[PDB]
Homo-oligomer: A and B are copies of this chain.
Amino acid sequence: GNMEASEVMKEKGNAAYKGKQWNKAVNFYTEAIKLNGANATYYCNRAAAFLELCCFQQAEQDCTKAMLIDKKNVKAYLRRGTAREELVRYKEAAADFRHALVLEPQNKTAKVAEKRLRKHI
């Protein structure tokens, strides 16, 4: 049924993402979400694919939804901060990278981001 099929779609999406097939990844994750809309990982993965396509608004929306489902999803904050930085929403980006560091203090991407964003906030 739907939940099990949703996971197969996620796996196909992951393989597409690993092969840099960002649009095919979006398509599979979109089907995964249609089949099961209550899994934060599907939204967070779809945000990842959207980032590589420079679909920053869609990435941001997916990250916000992922957080609604699971507020401790670290990658949702990293990805949303990335999108927000692209969209020159620097204080919001810095807030997301700061939250990622609350959840995961050793995260190097987020540490690097905070240093870079100081000049804009």
A interface with B by C-beta (< 8 Å): 51-54, 82, 108-109, 112, 116, 118-120
Using CB atoms, name the residue of chain B closest to A118. B52
Number of copies: 2
Q: How far is the CA of A54 from the CA of B53 in the complex (A)?
A: 27
Known contacts A108-B108, A112-B112: does B54 contact A120 (CB below 8 Å)? Answer: yes
Using CB atoms, name the residue of chain B closest to A55. B119
Using CB atoms, name the residue of chain B closest to A56. B119
* Contact present for A116 and B82 (CB under 8 Å): yes
Using CB atoms, name the residue of chain B closest to A52. B119
Q: List 11 A-B contacts (CB under 8 A).
A: A51-B119, A52-B118, A52-B119, A53-B119, A54-B119, A54-B120, A82-B116, A108-B108, A108-B112, A109-B112, A112-B112
